[PDB]
Amino acid sequence: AFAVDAAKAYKDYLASGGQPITNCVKMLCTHTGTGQAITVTPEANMDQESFGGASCCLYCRCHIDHPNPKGFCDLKGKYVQIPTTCANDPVGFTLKNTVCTVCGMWKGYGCSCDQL
């Protein structure tokens, strides 16, 4: 019945004013990419930074099991695009946000599916 809730702990730590996790691995890239959230190679656009995925994953970085029956990681081995305005805290960003299953953009930071 007991399980450590790392996500809640980090969210609460941030709201308490804690310094975000550092040393997320930012990649050099053209910044002319598609802007999709999680990609096999860096795809940042002009308003994003691209990071190595593992280094932006709370569970990878904290050395804890992934919250998934199979313990799979959505980020490891891929690249994550983070809005430049949020690139001070890539782990918080990936933890708090959701990828659109249709267009591959971050909900609220690229996904335009709910338009028209």
Partner 1 sequence: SSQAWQPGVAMPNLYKMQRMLLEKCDLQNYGDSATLPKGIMMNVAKYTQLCQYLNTLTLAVPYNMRVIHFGAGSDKGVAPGTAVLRQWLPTGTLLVDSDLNDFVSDADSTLIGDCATVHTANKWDLIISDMYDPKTKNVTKENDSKEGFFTYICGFIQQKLALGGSVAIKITEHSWNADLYKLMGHFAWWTAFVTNVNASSSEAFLIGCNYLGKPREQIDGYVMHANYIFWRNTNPIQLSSYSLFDMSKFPLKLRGTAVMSLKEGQINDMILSLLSKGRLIIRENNRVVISSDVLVNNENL
Interface with Zn ion (CB under 5 A): 57, 59-60, 73, 76, 100, 102-103, 111, 113
Q: Which pair of tokens denotes residue 36?
A: 């999709």
Judged by CB under 8 A, does residue 6 bind partner 1? Answer: no
Smaller CB distance to partner 1: residue 3 or 40? Answer: 40
Q: Minimal distance in Å, beta carbon 48 to partner 1?
A: 13
By CB under 8 A, name the one of 49, 83, 95, 106 that touches partner 1. Answer: 49
Rounded to the nearest angstrom, the gap between the alpha carbon of residue 36 and the centroid of all alpha carbons in its chain is 11
Cβ partners under 8 Å of residue 81, min gap 6: 33, 35, 36, 37, 38, 39, 42, 43, 44, 45, 48, 49, 50, 51, 106
Q: Which pair of tokens denotes residue 15?
A: 């709201």
Smaller CB distance to Zn ion: residue 14 or 38? Answer: 38
Residues at the binding site for Zn(2+) are: 57, 60, 66, 73, 100, 103, 111, 113
